[PDB]
Amino acid sequence: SFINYSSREINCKIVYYGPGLCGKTTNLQYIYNKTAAETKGKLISLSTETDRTLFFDFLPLSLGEIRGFKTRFHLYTVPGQVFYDASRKLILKGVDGVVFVADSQIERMEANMESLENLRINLAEQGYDLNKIPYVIQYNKRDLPNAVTVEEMRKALNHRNIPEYQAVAPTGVGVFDTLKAVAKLVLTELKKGGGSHHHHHH
Ligand SMILES: Nc1nc2c(ncn2[C@@H]2O[C@H](COP(=O)(O)OP(=O)(O)O)[C@@H](O)[C@H]2O)c(=O)[nH]1
C-alpha cells in the first residue's frame, strides 16, 4: 500500500491477472461503470508499441476510516495478448491483492495453468509469496457450453481453498463478489497491522 499522510488515504493496489482474453478488461469496465462518478478517477489506458496497462482508482463512500485514514482502491491489469513477460512483472510491483481471472473454457485451461504459475514466479521474483498476500480466484465465462465444471476448475487451479467466485463478467455476474472478497482481505490486513511497515520521509 501507499499511505499518503497528506491526503490521509491508504492507497491499495489490486491486480487482476490471468491469461490473455480471459475477462480482465471486462471486470474492470463493469466495476468502473457501476462506481459513483464523484468517487472515481478516469479509466486510464497506457499503451506502448505492444503491451498495455489498464487501471483506475476510486474511494468507496461506504467504507469507514481505519485509524483516521480512508482507503482508495486502484485496480490494475495488463489486458489482451501479452508480448513481454516484463509487463506482467511490472504490473505486480507494489501489489496489495490479486484477483486471478481464469477462463473456464477447456481450450484455455492450459493457458490458465501457465498464467497461474507465471503469477507465482513473478510475485516471488519481487519478494511476494502468493500464499501470503490477499488472493482470490474468479472462474469466468461460466455461461459458455465449453466451460468446465467448478470441480475441474478447482482440481486444476485451486488446491489451497482460495476464495473462489463464478463469474460471467459481461453481465456482471460474480464481478462485485470477487472484488469485495479481495478488498475485504486487504482491509482486514490493514486493520490488524499485518505486513511490513516502512516509514519514508520523502
Ligand atoms: N461469453 C463470455 N465472454 C466473455 C466473458 N468475459 C469476457 N468475455 C469476452 O472475452 C473477450 C476478452 O475479454 P477481455 O475482458 O477483453 O479480456 P482480457 O484480455 O483478460 O482483458 C471479450 O470479447 C469479452 O467480451 C464471459 O464471462 N463470458
Residue numbers in the entry: 2 to 203
Task: List passages from the publication reporting this PDB structure.
The localization of motility complexes, and thereby the direction of movement, is determined by an oscillatory system, which includes Mutual gliding motility A (MglA), a small Ras-like GTPase, and Mutual gliding motility B (MglB), its GTPase activating protein (GAP) as major components. In this study, we report the biochemical and structural characterization of M. xanthus MglA and MglB (MxMglA and MxMglB). Thus, MxMglB plays a dual role in increasing the GTPase activity of MxMglA by orienting the catalytic residues (role of a GAP) and by facilitating exchange of GDP with GTP (role of a GEF). Allosteric binding of the C-terminal helix (Ct-helix) of MxMglB on MxMglA facilitates nucleotide exchange.
Structure of MxMglA is similar to TtMglA with 2 additional β-strands (β0 and β2*), compared with the 5 α-helices and 6 β-strands present in the small Ras-like GTPase fold. All the residues of the small Ras-like GTPase fold as well as the C-terminal hexahistidine tag were modeled in the MxMglA structure. Though GDP was not added during protein purification or crystallization, the crystal structure of MxMglA contained GDP in the nucleotide-binding pocket. High-performance liquid chromatography (HPLC) analysis of the protein sample reconfirmed that the bound ligand is GDP. The purified MxMglA contained GDP bound to the active site pocket.
